[PDB]
Design a protein around this motif. Structure first.
Motif, PDB file in Angstrom:
ATOM      1  N   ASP A 152       0.815  -1.354   0.004  1.00  0.00           N
ATOM      2  CA  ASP A 152      -0.187  -0.013  -0.088  1.00  0.00           C
ATOM      3  C   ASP A 152       0.741   1.133   0.130  1.00  0.00           C
ATOM      4  O   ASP A 152       0.475   2.288  -0.669  1.00  0.00           O
ATOM      5  CB  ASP A 152      -1.007  -0.020   1.344  1.00  0.00           C
ATOM      6  CG  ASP A 152      -1.998   0.887   1.008  1.00  0.00           C
ATOM      7  OD1 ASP A 152      -2.792   0.943   0.127  1.00  0.00           O
ATOM      8  OD2 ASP A 152      -2.005   2.111   2.146  1.00  0.00           O
ATOM      9  N   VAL A 153       2.008   1.388   0.674  1.00  0.00           N
ATOM     10  CA  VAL A 153       2.821   2.533   0.793  1.00  0.00           C
ATOM     11  C   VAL A 153       3.779   2.651  -0.466  1.00  0.00           C
ATOM     12  O   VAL A 153       3.479   3.942  -1.184  1.00  0.00           O
ATOM     13  CB  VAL A 153       4.008   2.230   1.922  1.00  0.00           C
ATOM     14  CG1 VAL A 153       5.170   3.086   2.025  1.00  0.00           C
ATOM     15  CG2 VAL A 153       3.409   2.515   3.129  1.00  0.00           C
ATOM     16  N   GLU A 154       3.897   1.674  -1.049  1.00  0.00           N
ATOM     17  CA  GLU A 154       4.345   1.663  -2.544  1.00  0.00           C
ATOM     18  C   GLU A 154       3.244   1.936  -3.919  1.00  0.00           C
ATOM     19  O   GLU A 154       3.804   2.647  -4.846  1.00  0.00           O
ATOM     20  CB  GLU A 154       5.092   0.458  -3.162  1.00  0.00           C
ATOM     21  CG  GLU A 154       6.729   0.416  -2.556  1.00  0.00           C
ATOM     22  CD  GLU A 154       7.433  -0.425  -3.450  1.00  0.00           C
ATOM     23  OE1 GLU A 154       8.080   0.138  -4.634  1.00  0.00           O
ATOM     24  OE2 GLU A 154       7.670  -1.621  -3.402  1.00  0.00           O
ATOM     25  N   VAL A 155       2.009   2.080  -3.426  1.00  0.00           N
ATOM     26  CA  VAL A 155       1.072   2.588  -4.141  1.00  0.00           C
ATOM     27  C   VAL A 155       0.945   3.873  -4.130  1.00  0.00           C
ATOM     28  O   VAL A 155       0.715   4.677  -5.071  1.00  0.00           O
ATOM     29  CB  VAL A 155      -0.338   1.995  -3.732  1.00  0.00           C
ATOM     30  CG1 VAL A 155      -1.577   2.905  -4.464  1.00  0.00           C
ATOM     31  CG2 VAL A 155      -0.659   0.376  -4.568  1.00  0.00           C
ATOM     32  N   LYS A 156       1.239   4.412  -2.842  1.00  0.00           N
ATOM     33  CA  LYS A 156       1.320   5.882  -2.657  1.00  0.00           C
ATOM     34  C   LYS A 156       2.587   6.447  -3.058  1.00  0.00           C
ATOM     35  O   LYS A 156       2.270   7.503  -3.705  1.00  0.00           O
ATOM     36  CB  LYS A 156       1.315   5.665  -0.845  1.00  0.00           C
ATOM     37  CG  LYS A 156       0.300   6.692  -0.381  1.00  0.00           C
ATOM     38  CD  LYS A 156      -1.058   5.733  -0.584  1.00  0.00           C
ATOM     39  CE  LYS A 156      -2.370   6.507  -0.244  1.00  0.00           C
ATOM     40  NZ  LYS A 156      -2.595   7.740  -1.337  1.00  0.00           N
ATOM     41  N   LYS A 157       3.726   6.065  -3.035  1.00  0.00           N
ATOM     42  CA  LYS A 157       4.905   6.277  -3.854  1.00  0.00           C
ATOM     43  C   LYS A 157       4.568   6.249  -5.155  1.00  0.00           C
ATOM     44  O   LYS A 157       4.622   7.331  -5.843  1.00  0.00           O
ATOM     45  CB  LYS A 157       5.868   5.336  -3.608  1.00  0.00           C
ATOM     46  CG  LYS A 157       7.225   5.365  -4.038  1.00  0.00           C
ATOM     47  CD  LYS A 157       7.458   5.036  -5.459  1.00  0.00           C
ATOM     48  CE  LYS A 157       7.207   3.411  -5.875  1.00  0.00           C
ATOM     49  NZ  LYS A 157       8.432   2.817  -5.469  1.00  0.00           N
ATOM     50  N   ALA A 158       3.688   5.290  -6.115  1.00  0.00           N
ATOM     51  CA  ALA A 158       3.527   5.560  -7.364  1.00  0.00           C
ATOM     52  C   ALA A 158       2.521   6.434  -7.874  1.00  0.00           C
ATOM     53  O   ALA A 158       2.657   6.996  -8.777  1.00  0.00           O
ATOM     54  CB  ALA A 158       2.938   4.075  -7.678  1.00  0.00           C
ATOM     55  N   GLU A 159       1.473   6.909  -6.827  1.00  0.00           N
ATOM     56  CA  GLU A 159       0.893   8.370  -7.089  1.00  0.00           C
ATOM     57  C   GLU A 159       1.483   9.256  -7.115  1.00  0.00           C
ATOM     58  O   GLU A 159       1.180  10.119  -7.898  1.00  0.00           O
ATOM     59  CB  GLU A 159      -0.217   8.229  -5.590  1.00  0.00           C
ATOM     60  CG  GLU A 159      -1.182   7.250  -5.996  1.00  0.00           C
ATOM     61  CD  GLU A 159      -2.627   7.485  -5.269  1.00  0.00           C
ATOM     62  OE1 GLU A 159      -2.694   7.315  -3.954  1.00  0.00           O
ATOM     63  OE2 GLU A 159      -3.723   8.033  -5.602  1.00  0.00           O
ATOM     64  N   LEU A 160       2.447   9.345  -6.237  1.00  0.00           N
ATOM     65  CA  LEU A 160       3.390  10.688  -6.173  1.00  0.00           C
ATOM     66  C   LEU A 160       4.187  10.450  -7.651  1.00  0.00           C
ATOM     67  O   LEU A 160       4.332  11.638  -8.376  1.00  0.00           O
ATOM     68  CB  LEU A 160       4.543  10.861  -5.252  1.00  0.00           C
ATOM     69  CG  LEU A 160       4.223  10.351  -3.676  1.00  0.00           C
ATOM     70  CD1 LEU A 160       5.456  10.730  -2.829  1.00  0.00           C
ATOM     71  CD2 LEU A 160       2.775  10.996  -3.474  1.00  0.00           C
TER      72      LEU A 160
END
Length: 119
Positions: A50-58
């Motif tokens: 989920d944190v790397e989805v958040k990364k990917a949104e940035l």
């Protein structure tokens, strides 16, 4: 997104670094719990996915507004990282399925530890 977008990606990266740091706290599990080899603690991989989805949104906040504002490409990519959110959330099923499976009658009704609940 936008903001320049450099502003939004930089300020949110500072957050994604705290997010990464806490996933490294659950990595501390996956190197202390190797000793024990329960290590593969899905609570880590849930958070890290989920944190790397958040990364990917940035990363997409750049590729909207740096950029040709072919608005469809950020939106496409949101649906792709939403599948990776669904994978993070499918591990949330695996920690639950683990929990009920490894309940090998731990509650023997004679653990003595019950005294905190039933004095």
């Amino acid at each position: 997104g936008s903001h320049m977008p450099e502003k939004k990606v930089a300020e949110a990266e500072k957050k994604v670094e705290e997010a990464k740091k806490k996933a490294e706290d659950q990595k501390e599990e996956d190197r202390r719990n190797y000793p024990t080899n329960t290590y593969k603690t899905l609570e880590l991989e849930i958070a890290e996915s989920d944190v790397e989805v958040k990364k990917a949104e940035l990363e997409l906040v750049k590729e909207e507004a740096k950029e040709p504002r072919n608005e469809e490409k950020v939106k496409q990519a949101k649906a792709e990282v939403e599948s990776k959110k669904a994978e993070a959330t499918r591990l949330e099923k695996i920690k639950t399925d683990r929990k009920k499976a490894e309940e090998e009658a731990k509650r023997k009704a004679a653990e003595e530890d019950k005294v905190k609940e039933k004095p």
